[PDB]
Structure formats: structure tokens, C-alpha cells
Amino acid sequence: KLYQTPLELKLKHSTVHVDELCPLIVPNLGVAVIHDYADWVKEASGDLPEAQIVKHWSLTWTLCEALWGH
Amino acid sequence: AKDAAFATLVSDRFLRDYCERGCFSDLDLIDNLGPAMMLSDRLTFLGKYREFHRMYGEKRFADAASLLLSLMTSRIAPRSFWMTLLTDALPLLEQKQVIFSAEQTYELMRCLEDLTSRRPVHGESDTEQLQDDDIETTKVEMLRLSLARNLARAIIREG
Amino acid sequence: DMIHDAQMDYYGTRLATCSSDRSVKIFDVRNGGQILIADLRGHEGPVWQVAWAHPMYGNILASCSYDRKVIIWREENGTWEKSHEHAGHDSSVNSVCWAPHDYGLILACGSSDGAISLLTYTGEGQWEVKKINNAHTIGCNAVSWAPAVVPPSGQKPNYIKRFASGGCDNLIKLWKEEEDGQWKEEQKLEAHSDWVRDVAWAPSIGLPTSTIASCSQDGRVFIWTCDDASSNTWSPKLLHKFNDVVWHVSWSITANILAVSGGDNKVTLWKESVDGQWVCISDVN
Amino acid sequence: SYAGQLESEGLWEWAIFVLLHIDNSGIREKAVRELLTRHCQLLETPESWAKETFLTQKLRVPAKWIHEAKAVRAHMESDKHLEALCLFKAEHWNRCHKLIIRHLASDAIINENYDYLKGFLEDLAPPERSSLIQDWETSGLVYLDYIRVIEMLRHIQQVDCSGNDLEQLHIKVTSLCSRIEQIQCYSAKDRLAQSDMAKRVANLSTPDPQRVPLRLLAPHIGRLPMPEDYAMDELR
Amino acid sequence: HNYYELLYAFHIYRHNYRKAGTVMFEYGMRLGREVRTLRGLEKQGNCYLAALNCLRLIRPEYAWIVQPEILELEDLEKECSLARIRLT
């Protein structure tokens, strides 16, 4: 979450428009944030979330992608 | 009474009350202050100042006033009205021209140099010269300029 | 020796500190490095609180003292000279805060004689003294303004201009500016048992549920909140009860975490949970 | 909650992206304004890009608010002489000539560095023309005429005629300096800059006025109340 | 002859409109600032007295070049007070 590559990847997967001088998320199909959908599994390695608390996050992301995933 | 602390305070109050206008009157020829010898010889400065403010005899009165001011500015008669007396005496020297001071210009310069590096409080309505000023250093600058003019226009009188 | 109140500037710029030695030091914080710039001195009593102005009106910083006077020094070209000086109070000033940027450059100052001055800057350096007497019994002790809530034309929207003040009469009376020009007491909140120390209003982050925290000398911390807008219903809620008295009470802008400062010389961070009860996050120092 | 958690650590782009995905427009705009006012120099797109090549402009956000927030933060954290150039050149002033003129008055020293003052005076006209201003335009004109008068006095030392706009510039400088008498203003740096600009051109033309304010503030404040007519005070 | 030249310039200015004596005094003080403990203090006192006289004998608008008016006078007074406190 402290990298700019994730923000750049998440900003390109949404369609925003200027409405009354305010940006709103109209159409979105993915997000590269922490503990998201299928795009958050690649940002959880041994050099991003240490090693003592990465397996649980990966399992929670996989379960959410397999259950709440279309 | 107890010591000289009361006599010094009374002398300072008299000197502050006498210096308020152009002519130091108020308590003119009404000071006396005669007690024993040690407590009576300390009141000679006030008497000399009163005699110089009342009567005048060529440059003798000016020399006596300058000597009294130099003696009072040497940590003797306090230091409240000393700056005012010095500024009033420097206004009658040669602020607009050039004069002469035998055994007095160097003393006035030393007094102005010592009062500028220590503490200086001047508060006395003299005449038209004091009303046109603003800061306290203006009187010292005028006195220094007058002393320089006197030393430049009087030290070349060789025999 | 001992400092009283030290608030930051704008976006973490300088840090105006105030101690009991009548010295309003303005220290700069550059990358975590504390460095003093100037020492504004000109009060006969000890300095209490200090609040900085907005960046739209230059760089002003007002600080109250115990000499029955309020100094408002500016900052331009490295000259921290005093611009305005308000001394309309009879007793010592306890708290002195400013209003929002949308309403102008108003500054509310509470005294210890039961009055609340409101220095409203006009088109220049002239400030109108709009004080309101008979505001407290033993005197005011806290002053904080509410958030700027906006109410088919080309003009500025007139806000309600609300400001909740705390005093030593165990009543947090909130003020409201009428359409005539004078301020009046809207409602009172008598829920404390002793003298109210500090009472800062929580900033709304777009939600209409405006809250306001208060701290008294009895050790209780009340969090009065409103149910809806345009409804005089200030339901107080007890957050924590300590054995000692509390000093100041600040709130955050993101999660609105209440910073309870007081008790045994320690600061505690209180945050509202999902159940509605306030719990302590961690301990400072 | 996500925008607050992302902003409490130091991430501005993530916090802005989390706040932009809200429901209420009035709350989202306020959150975006608060996030821009809290931190704007760390994630700026224009003026030397260093935020991964346009980070806030790609989220369908206006660049006028971010630039204004960055200018307001620089005017409070950095100096006033360097923060005025980032506000007028950002194309988001909207009748902000008074703030620029007040900020540019801090660099009144260093007479040999008039290039920055000339550039500021030349750039202040573009913002006033873009913001549709055709009424209050005296401080910038006086500041532009002062530098030109100083340059003409430093280059030509034998000329002593009227410069047409010299009288208008002097009248504008006098009206700006008489703020304490017009609307009772307690300005210090601006008044000092105006006095310096009015006195730097008095050694060539005429300048009958431009002085101080009698003895009402010199013999009653601390023997110091801005010098002016020292020649008239020490001469006759 | 710097003092004589400054006096002549001040007289020529007063014989026209009188609006450059303070600027000349400020330029002279800036050119001859670093001196010693006694000479520098005397020069600072003379400059302060000249500035006070100029402020007392003037009444129109604002004119104070070579001085970064009110703020410059306050800074000069603070510097003089600091020098007097350090020398005593």
C-alpha cells in the first residue's frame, strides 16, 4: 500500500467523471488495494508483507476471490 | 540622620526639581544644607549649579557648570538628571557655531562616551532646541559635533 | 519552565509555543527538527492558549495571556510585529480561538469575568469589539467554534455561526449569531459537577451528526452529540471517568479520535467503536 | 475509514482515491479539499512532476484546487517571496492580486536584484487579464513603475523631467501607504516596501510628498518611527 | 569628506523637496556598519538619532529606501537594544 505502482494499477481500472466539480467512481471492475479481489494476490509476497503474516492474508484473499468473485 | 542615603536622595530630588525649564530656578538661593563637614561638603555641586544658573561671569560660570556636570556624571550625584543637565549645558556651548573649552571638551567627550555605553535617561524641557529633537542620542551627537568644531577652530591658536 | 498550550501552524509548518514566562516562542519544525525563529514578548501575565489564523489572510497568530489583553502579531518579511491589541476584558483570558475561513477573520476570546469578546476584522486592521457580557457566573474557561456548514443567486451563503463556550458554572453554553448582529445563548448543557476545563468541538467530515467534547474538573469526559440538524437536542454521553482533573481535550480530523489530556500527567487517545461506546486506543509517552 | 487510514500513514494518492469513491458529493468534495489542504506538495503534477506522472489529474479531479492548496501551504511553510510565483503561474488565482502583491512586498531588499521584481510585475498583468479585472489595478502598476524609475535613475543621472505616469505612480503609492488613515490598517512589511519604492525614485524626479507622520508617533513610541525627511530635519 | 558630501546632498535636497536625506543616511550606515565596539555603537546611536529626527520632522506618506520603514525601524531599535545589553 506504500508503493505507487499499486495506485497506478488501481487508477487505470476505473472510469471516473467530473460531476459538479467532484470526482466519483461510476464504473469499476477491479482494484489493486490491500485485501481486494483477484488483483491483490500478486502484491502479497515475501518482500511486501514480511513472512510471518502473509500466508493468512493470501488465504483470505483467495477465499474472497473464490467466493465473492464472479 | 542615619547616613548619607537621605542626603543624596534629597540632593537628587532638588536637582531634578530645579532642572525643568531654561533657567534652573525653583530652589534658587534656598538650599543651604550644612551639617558637620562630610555631610556638608557633598552639597557643593548643587550650590555651584545654582550659582551658575543665577549669575554669570564671562566663561567662568560655564567652566564651573561643566566641572559640576563632570563631577556629577562620575557616579557621584546619582544618574537620573545628569544626562538632562549635560544636554542642557551642551545646548549653550557652540551648537550653531564654534567656541572654545579649556580643560572641558575632552571631559565632555569622555562623559558622552561613558554615558552611551552604560545608561542614559534625559527628561527635561529646556527651550526651543530640546523641543525639535526626538531621540536621546541627538543631544550627544550635537555635543560631539560642537566639541569637534571647537577643537578644530580653537586648537590652532599658537603663540 | 512549564509550557501551557502549543499548537501547530498550517499543514505542519511552525509551532507556536506558550509558557508561563510571558514568552510566545514560534519554533519551526523542518523534517522533525525543532528550530526557534522569534520570541514575541509583551505581556504582564502568563500566556494561556494560542491559535493560528488561516493562510488566506497572510500569516497571523493570536495568543492570549493573563494580563487582560490579547495580542495578534503578523508574520511578513521576517517581521513578527504586533498588528492589533485588544484589551477589552477585565479579568484574565483563558481561551482564545478563531472562526472559520468562510466567515472571515473573527476571533473569539473568553475571559475570567463572564464575558466573550469577538474581534471581527473588517476591510483592514480595524477590528470591531463585539463582546457579550453576562456569559458565565465565575467566568469562561473554553472557547471553540463549530464547523462551517453551508445552508440560486450570486452571493455568499450566510452560515449559522455557532460557537460552544465552556465556563466555571458547570454549563457549556453554545452561542449563535442572529440576523441583527448580536449573539445570544441558544442552549445550555449542564451535565458537569465542577468547573469545565476545555471544550473543543469536533470537526464534521461531511456528516450532519455534529459532536462536541467537553472536560470538567470532576474527571468526567462528556461527548455531546446531535441527532439531526435544526433540532435543539444535545444528548451527552460519558466517555471516561478519572480520579484526577483533565486539562485539554483535542480531536482528530480523519477518524475524529478524542485526545484526552489530563489526569496523571498522561495523554490518552479515545476512539468510538462500532457498538457506540468509547474505548481507549493507546497511551502516549 | 479507508481514506483516513491511508492518510494517517502518509499516503496521499491512496487516501484521495479512497475518498473519491463515496456516495454523497458534498462530503466527497469536502474530504478531497481537506486532503489537498493537508498535503499537496508531495503529490503535485504540474511544476516539476514528481508524483508518478500526473497522479491526481488522472482521477478526473480539477487541477485548480490542488494548485491553490499547494500555494496556500507554501505561503505558510516556505517564504512569501517564493510562494507568490507558484500561485500566479498556476492559472488558478481568480482575483488574487492582493495576496500576490502582499507576498511580493517581502523581497523589497537587494536593489541589485530587480529582475525578479520586474518578472513578478510582468506576470501579475497576465493573471489580472485572465481573471477579468479592469478596476482595482494600482499596486501592481506602482510596483512596475517603481522598478522602471529606479532603473532610469541608475542609468540616467542628468534627467529631471516629468515621466507622465510618475505622478500617477506617486499618487498610487501615497494612497497605498495611507491605509492607516483610509481603512486603519496596521501593515508593516507592505508599508516598508511601499516606502522603499517611493524613496528609491525620489533621488531623480521631485517627490514633494512621501514623508512620515509628524511627531505624534516619533516622540511617543520609542524614538523610532521610520525616517523620511532627514534633509529637512537636519537642514533649512 | 563623506560627511561634508552627505551634508551638501541633504542641503540640496531640502532646497528642492527634501526626500533623500534618510536614504543617504541609511546607505551610509549600511556601507559603514561593521566597525568596533565603541565606534560602531556611536555610529548606530547617531543613525538612530537621525532616523528619529527624520520621523519627527516629516508628515505626508511613506519614504524609506535602503531599509528592509516601520519594520526597519523596529529591527534597528531591537539591534541597538541588543548591542546595549551586550556591551553593559
Author numbering:
A (entry chain AE): 333 to 402
B (entry chain AH): 493 to 651
C (entry chain AF): 14 to 164, 171 to 304
D (entry chain AE): 671 to 874, 891 to 922
E (entry chain AJ): 1078 to 1145, 1176 to 1195
Task: Show me the paper's own sentences about this structure.
Nuclear pore complexes (NPCs) create large conduits for cargo transport between the nucleus and cytoplasm across the nuclear envelope (NE). These multi-megadalton structures are composed of about thirty different nucleoporins that are distributed in three main substructures (the inner, cytoplasmic and nucleoplasmic rings) around the central transport channel. Here we use cryo-electron tomography on DLD-1 cells that were prepared using cryo-focused-ion-beam milling to generate a structural model for the human NPC in its native environment.
Bending at recognized ‘hinge points’, we fit the Y complex. It docks into both the CR and NR in a reticulated pattern of eight-membered rings. The principal Y-complex arrangement in both the CR and NR follows a reticulated pattern composed of two eight-membered rings. In each ring, we observed considerable density beyond the Y complexes. In contrast to the IR, the diameters of the CR and NR are nearly identical to previous models. At both the CR and NR, the Y-complex rings are angled more inward towards the central channel.
